[PDB]
């Protein structure tokens, strides 16, 4: 059921957690979020406080240009913010992509 | 990892899929969504078109009064809407609860 439950989260919230892992720094998630404009990023949780890291090296120049025009500039660099701001962070990305 | 990935979806999107099941009608999900105001409901998928069914019989009178004051009235009855409206439906519930 885990695979269809993730499908629901994708249709309901336009977000997909590809996988998780825990390194020395903390617990990390590979995440994509969409609307067709899509953004890929990692969220780290260190113990809590949240680290956001955009995954942009693979994206094409046309792709980067579209995202940059509409998304807030800080979304294209690493960012640290409190856990209590995580849902707003999700909504800001969602509102910017759509 | 499935349990911590669901925890992330909860913190990121303020929603939790308790479980799924498939009956004769289709595929169903028990879902809670929150901000502290919380709403419990089932989403059915019939093949697609979406059926929303609020789960209110257990809630107390004080709880129902708070939700009713702020949430749209149609969220307290069964509702059917196209799959392409599912993310807006999520966002409307999210915006109304917060």
């Amino acid at each position: 059921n885990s695979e269809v439950i993730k499908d629901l989260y994708e249709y309901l919230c336009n977000v997909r957690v590809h996988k998780s892992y825990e390194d020395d720094s903390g617990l990390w998630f590979d995440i994509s979020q969409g609307t067709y404009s899509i953004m890929d990023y990692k969220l780290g949780f260190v113990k809590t406080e949240v680290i956001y890291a955009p995954v942009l090296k693979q994206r094409s120049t046309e792709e980067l240009y579209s995202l940059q025009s509409k998304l807030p500039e800080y979304l294209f660099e690493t960012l640290s913010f409190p856990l209590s701001s995580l849902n707003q962070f999700y909504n800001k990305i969602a509102k910017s992509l759509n | 990892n499935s349990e911590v990935i669901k925890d992330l979806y909860e913190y990121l999107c303020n929603v939790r899929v308790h479980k799924s099941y498939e009956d004769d009608s289709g595929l169903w999900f028990d879902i809670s969504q929150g901000t502290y105001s919380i709403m419990d409901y089932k989403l059915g998928f019939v093949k697609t078109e979406v059926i929303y069914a609020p789960v209110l019989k257990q809630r107390s009178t004080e709880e129902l009064y708070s939700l009713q004051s702020k949430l749209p009235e149609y969220l307290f009855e069964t509702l059917s809407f196209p799959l392409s409206s599912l993310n807006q439906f999520y966002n409307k519930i999210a915006k109304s609860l917060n």
């Binding site: 269809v4 499908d7 629901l8 994708e10 249709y11 977000v15 997909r16 590809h18 996988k19 390194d23 720094s25 990390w28 590979d30 994509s32 969409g34 899509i38 890929d40 990692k42 780290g44 680290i51 890291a53 995954v55 090296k57 693979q58 994206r59 690493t78 | 289709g26 595929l27 998928f45 093949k47 697609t48």
Partner: peptide, 26 residues
């Protein structure tokens, strides 16, 4: 059993997992 169309049939975001191939934590 016969094939049955999935309820969620559109191409998902599962394809994008490959975007994280060579990336490390910051």
């Amino acid at each position: 059993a016969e094939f049955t169309s999935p309820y969620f049939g559109r191409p998902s975001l599962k394809t994008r997992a490959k975007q994280f191939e060579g990336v490390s934590s910051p």
